Design a protein around this ligand. Structure first.
Ligand code: SF4
Ligand code: SF4
Lengths: 143, 61
């Protein structure tokens, strides 16, 4: 079921997809007790509880330190760094105007998750060809 | 102007014969220049639309 809230691309570094949010609160636990900035909260009193910023203020206007913990600790694409959007895979480049029907057609036809998930694992495996992950030490502060 | 039958073959060197054989390909390249540029454009479009990287990933992984 689609959540009645909009995606917040206000922040130049990360986005929030409410329709993909699973209210795990990993981001909320990180911002308050790990980063200890206390921007991220979840309004449970609402009909559809969602991850809020301050008093449901857009991320750019909010007290966001922009550390990026929330995106590190999120388990799915709900909290994601904007640098990956339409860049990670091969089929991800497709415009959302054509990719959204592409998804609806897939749901209608599919039988079980087992089969389509296996196909997705193949795109994920093909991703090793183009994406490289290299360990580095930050050239900013002496931390 | 006596009667003779011996024949002496000309010295087509290793690189000489090579340059003639290469010119053979270079001629068919010119003869099909039209289709060559057309295919290259099409191929550039396949990379443009991720078709080529999609296949590269497929074989690489
Ligand atoms: S970490 Fe991401 S997916 Fe999990 S509750 Fe927070 S916003 Fe939703
Ligand atoms: S980057 Fe922003 S949303 Fe993420 S933990 Fe830091 S202040 Fe909270």
């Amino acid at each position: 079921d689609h959540k009645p809230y909009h995606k917040d691309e206000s922040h130049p570094f990360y986005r929030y997809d409410p329709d993909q949010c699973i209210l795990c609160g990993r981001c909320v636990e990180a911002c308050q007790d790990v980063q200890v900035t206390e921007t991220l909260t979840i309004d449970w009193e609402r009909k559809r509880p969602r991850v809020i910023w301050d008093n449901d203020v857009p991320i750019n206007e909010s007290s966001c330190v922009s550390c990026g913990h929330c995106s590190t600790v999120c388990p799915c694409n709900a909290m994601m760094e904007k640098g990956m959007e339409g860049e990670a895979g091969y089929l991800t480049g497709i415009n959302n105007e054509t990719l959204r029907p592409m998804i609806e057609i897939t749901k209608g036809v599919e039988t079980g998750y087992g089969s389509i998930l296996a196909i997705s694992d193949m795109e994920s495996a093909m991703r090793d060809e183009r994406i490289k992950k290299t360990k580095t030490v930050c050239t900013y502060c002496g931390v | 102007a006596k009667a003779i039958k011996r024949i002496q073959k000309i010295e087509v060197t290793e690189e000489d014969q090579r340059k003639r054989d290469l010119r053979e390909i270079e001629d068919a390249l010119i003869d099909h220049k039209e289709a060559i540029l057309e295919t290259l454009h099409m191929l550039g479009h396949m990379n443009e639309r991720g078709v080529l990287p999609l296949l590269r990933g497929l074989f690489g992984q």
